[PDB]
Amino acid sequence: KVFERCELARTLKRLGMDGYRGISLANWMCLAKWESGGNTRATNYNAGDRSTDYGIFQINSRYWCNDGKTPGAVNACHLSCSALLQDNIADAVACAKRVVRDPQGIRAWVAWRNRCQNRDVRQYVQGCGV
């Protein structure tokens, strides 16, 4: 599924992402936008370390989900990476919350650092009623 902007904002808000561990909804929106364009079936293979990024937040298989083919990987979210490719983003959100409970918080994703940190992210939620 490829989310429309405000549709995603409300979806994430209902799933409890607004202010989760101090992270605003606009920050999550900026993350999804830059990670996959709001595409839940997006995947990115990393030939360098044999891992794959899955779903709307492009969560990596080395540490977060199990895909069975990533060498010496772990599964901190306790999900099959397949769960991160569903149209329903509930499991992906559950895993994104798990990611940010670690020390780095939202900084876990480098794309957030590159395109969202210290930027005007208000534009992502304006007019969405969130």
UniProtKB/Swiss-Prot annotation:
Its EC number is 3.2.1.17. InterPro entries: Glyco_hydro_22, Glyco_hydro_22_CS, Glyco_hydro_22_lys, Lysozyme-like_dom_sf. It is linked to Amyloidosis, hereditary systemic 5: A form of hereditary systemic amyloidosis, a disorder characterized by amyloid deposition in multiple tissues resulting in a wide clinical spectrum. AMYLD5 primarily affects the viscera, and the predominant clinical features are renal dysfunction of varying severity, and intra-abdominal bleeding. Inheritance is autosomal dominant. GO terms for molecular function: identical protein binding; lysozyme activity. The active site is at E35, D53. One of its GO terms (biological process) is defense response to Gram-positive bacterium. It is found in: Secreted. The keyword Protein transport does not apply. It comes from the Eukaryota. This is Lysozyme C.
